[PDB]
Subunit: 387 residues, 4 copies
């Protein structure tokens, strides 16, 4: 049951189903997949589109001619399937030249090169119809304290993003940027480690309106944070431009499990939030089919990502629509949380004896919040065991 269609806006990076299985302790377990084949297979599964890093599509070092050809072949597969490309990004982490970062490398020549490599890909992304350009600064950071002066590094990071905003403005492109935070791995500590740090940083750029965040489930969970709470803050700020979905089992290396695996209750609350807030961007999967799998397992893993999202969507919708749940929400005062604390204004509050002098603290303290009953209704709904 639960079959996805392109209207569900499910997207996948070419590097997800294309991951060959090389890990820090082992060789590849699968042969390389041609991007054309991945587009075809994903389309068959009901995906809406694909995403790419420049180097996933055009082998690093390719001549302008080989480049052409890679693009032409890719475009033909998109035309043949109806698949879209809503987002693109730059690989500023694989090649040895980026060992100390791209935008924040200590070497100035590298920083310049990083910007040129990025701008080249922005042109390509626009050509392919992408509306979001993601930046994951996976090598921006350090393993030791004296290696990076963080204030200088943020000055460099701001400079790079401001230059990119100037470029898109000048070309008149309709494309926005999304910064993807990650707390660590591959660097000991990565700069702008969480959604909060990325949101704060954006506020210091020259044209903040061009930038948002691209949070990833597993990344925030690597810091032990509540992913749905972080997404709520991004939505509250009007900055959720894109989202990366996957699963992670706690604080450890980035597992990139299929969506729904990892913390299942957090997946439920995330879907509840995306659907309630009416998020309309792509539902992108940045995951890796385990290296234990063959190609059949790759497609099964990708299909499971979409299936899990649809099952959760159904259960969250049934939860919110259940009259008994609506009643429990009022019992727990969720309605009162939505009302202004003092629309009456400061003076009125200062003059209100019921707010202090005559406030019965003990009576208020004795009121139960009834959160456990509400949470068991949510559990019953998730498990399909009532409501």
């Amino acid at each position: 049951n639960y079959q996805p269609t392109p209207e569900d806006r499910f997207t996948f990076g070419l590097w997800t189903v294309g991951w060959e299985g090389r890990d820090p302790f082992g060789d590849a377990t699968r042969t390389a997949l041609d991007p054309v084949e991945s587009v075809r297979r994903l389309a068959e599964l009901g995906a809406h589109g694909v995403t790419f890093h420049d180097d996933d599509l055009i082998p690093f070092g390719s001549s302008d001619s080989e480049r052409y050809e890679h693009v032409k072949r890719f475009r033909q597969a998109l035309d043949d399937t109806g698949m879209k490309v809503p987002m693109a990004t730059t690989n500023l982490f694989t090649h040895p030249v980026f060992k100390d970062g791209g935008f924040t490398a200590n070497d100035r020549d590298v920083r310049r090169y990083a910007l040129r490599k990025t701008i080249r890909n922005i042109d390509l992304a626009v050509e392919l119809g992408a509306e979001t350009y993601v930046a994951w600064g996976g090598r921006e950071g350090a393993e030791s304290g004296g290696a990076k002066d963080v204030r200088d590094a943020l000055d460099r990071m701001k400079e790079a993003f401001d230059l990119l905003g100037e470029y898109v403005t000048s070309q008149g492109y309709d494309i926005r940027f999304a910064i993807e935070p990650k707390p660590n791995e591959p660097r000991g500590d990565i700069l702008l480690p969480t959604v909060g740090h990325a949101l704060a940083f954006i506020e210091r750029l020259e044209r903040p309106e061009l930038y948002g965040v691209n949070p990833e489930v597993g990344h925030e969970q690597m810091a032990g944070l509540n992913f749905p709470h972080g997404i709520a803050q991004a939505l509250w700020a009007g900055k959720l431009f894109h989202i990366d979905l996957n699963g992670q089992n706690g604080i450890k290396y980035d597992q990139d499990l299929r969506f729904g695996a990892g913390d299942l209750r957090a997946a439920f609350w995330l879907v509840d939030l995306l659907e309630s807030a009416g998020y309309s961007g792509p539902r992108h999967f940045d995951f890796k089919p385990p290296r234990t799998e063959d190609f059949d397992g790759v497609w099964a893993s990708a299909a499971g990502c979409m299936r899990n999202y649809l099952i959760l969507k159904e259960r969250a919708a049934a939860f919110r629509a259940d009259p008994e749940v609506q009643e429990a929400l009022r019992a727990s005062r969720l309605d009162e949380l939505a009302r202004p604390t003092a629309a009456d204004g400061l003076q009125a509050l200062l003059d209100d004896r019921s707010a202090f002098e005559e406030f019965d603290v003990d009576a208020a303290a004795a009121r139960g919040m009834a959160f456990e009953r509400l949470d068991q209704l949510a559990m019953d709904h998730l498990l399909g065991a009532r409501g």
Copy 2:
């Protein structure tokens, strides 16, 4: 050796040395300390001042008269010792009425009460000469997903802070606010969990200039984050209004060990940064002498906080002043990180063939960063084993 003086600006909360030792699994191991006695003992140790929550100074429920008296006695001890009160805060977490929060409690009546209790203490803080008013929303959060709609909660949090800014503006007080983030404990997840989340939030307030952050070593470490990196971002934003120092051994409950305990290398890099950036606010200790200790152990623990800061200050200064270290910093290109990537401008960068077309990636990739030698010089300096 390493003796502190009031000029070192070391401050302590009354609740630190005054902690009786009650933990989630045990009764108090020490009798209550009179605030007057704590002021006297701290002054003797060389501290510069003390801080307080309203309820530490005036027992919750006190009549206006008893209140007077508590204040008069406290003021006399400050006058007798020369101790200052640079910061004050509100207890919106102990009393049962705050079980679901203060500013973000689902019950509107509680939210109003929370604001009135806070405003009352702001007046007192100003009277005592405090320049910073801290807000730690330790009960703002949840243990389950449906109990708190985070967007509504942030609307409530913004409303509360905006009202406080309106109050101080209207009274013409010279006092600024500092938000103290914490990821969890006592709530399952706390709102504005890290310095990044707090910085981002401040940017949406009506008068952002009145608010900064009051980060705490152990709090960011409870999320596995790099404390010195977070402080660098706060300084970069011009928002480090105050700082709380302590020690924590990784991701676990908030230990509140004395400063220098926990992650010693992180303590070194933090002191290096505070001293290099010329931070001039109080060096405040929010720690708890372990419940294994008697009063002698309390004073020994407090003294150790200051001693460790002074030892680290000396070692960081010797590190930065060592010619061999200055040379290693240039070998690692820290000087180049401080130079603009493209002061020449966007067009110039686009036209620069040395930045892309003729950039020798392999030659750049082959350059070692020499970070290990630099980090061993930092280790030798910390340990007093050379440079």
Copy 3:
């Protein structure tokens, strides 16, 4: 639906539903519950029995007479309800005298007192029909390195347990001991921090057969470990004497959420294992209804513990019984994992050219494990969305 009965063997500690809500940052939110009332309420919910620490039942310091009376009243409630007492334990953590431990306190006089307090409660436990006596050494550990020589502490821990084994042997009691590991909280680091450390320790006692483990979901998760894997090792060793069920959201303070909350997929795999291995001891809940709740919320939370176990039991049973799942298990070679690697013996293996000289490594390497399809079948079963 999913209604528990005494035959389900669900048990609760008096301190679980009796928790008043005092946390490290706040006062109690609920009045004390009389043990008699808790027995009655639990019986009504369908529980099978209750457990207790000596101090939960008899207020610390009680005269022999008051003690009698507390016991008589308790016994009458058990008789009136049919509730049993399968396990009992000692409180060697609340009173200030245990600030540095019970069995491993540096002070010898305290260690002697700890043993006497424990032996007194063993007699009571036997009288009430308990078959398991649990030991949670929550204060055995340290906050700093020089405070505890761990080898001396383990010698003391071994001495205490050997003396307890000698006591029960000598009295001819039929009661076994279960050690409950916890990695930290309230001490900075607790001795025998995980199920593995406790299992290893037992092997050095004088009569290892009298001791097993009493693992707790949240405790192993506080170390980021796989709870079901740890329980499998305890079962493999024949040492799972009892089990404590609750929920925990990752590495942070011990949350003690109701069972099913926290890591739901881990709860599923744990039930699958307990039910498949035919574990027949009590299903004990060591949890705390959140301090946000009133008495109605306490009973709702306790009921949810049992409900979640029964729902998971049903889903795990449907998973194992599904023919499609049985087929997937064979596709993934779970049947081959159960077969001896070399029942043929060492020489035969050494002489087997198919095991090395003629083994086709590439062909074996190319075989997919089909684990993703199997895991999606498990997800579908948990969610009630097929199989």
Copy 4:
């Protein structure tokens, strides 16, 4: 200063200084090092010996002849330098055939192959004079619950180790086994995740005396555990056969930093313990020079490992030898922890009224442990700022 000599017993794996820098997100940053060159360079730095995985020395797939040659060349470098080979191990993790494990792979044919590959290397290890054979089952584990029945897997693990013990017994070799635990990475959860789990497992083998543990600093820290406490338990059991030293900054991916980096205070307490207990095996470094470094940085990193150990050794020795520290140890009752709790026996304890009936709990409770003063003396000693 602090110069190592072969008498310090410092050893390094060929794969440590030989790590090319490939990580999950990037290509190699350094060319391959010939083992002969690494032996020569390490000897120059003052190391005592090297260790190897079969595949580090003989390229996987090598003919018996090429194998000979690799060994002959290696032996000549050992002869030319005086370097020893105290430990050897098997690579049962890199090749795709081991994607689901070696000893616990679901496929029986793989398990047989894993044993044959291991036995072949045991013969070589003995030939080279190794006294310890390490087993790190990095691929033994799972990413999902149904993929591995843990009881069957432990039966397979026990079978493999018993067969290896039978082999060495039968050949009359003088070599012991050491199991190296790791909680996760590369598998989602690894079997025998901590030193405790490995110690417990050994007790179920047929000849437990042939097996011990080879704990690694960073591995236990990836579970948030106290490394020195775990080593104390291994020593207490008489099972510390070897030890792997490195640095790790908390719960995250395995960083493999040089020893002394990471948690410096834990490094201090570990050296204090190894030196006090008189551990006489190799001080082995299993670390990776960061990929930011060139060959000069590799040698600087390796040298720093040894330097840090020697500096810590000096500071721990000065701490233990300081009369003021000896006095503080008695003030904290470390002497009393070393005395039997009840050498008088059980009956005597039962009859001792001073142990219960007349024990003054309040007086005992009021005694401070004086641990903070002791810990500040340890800090002063580590920092070279007194005692």
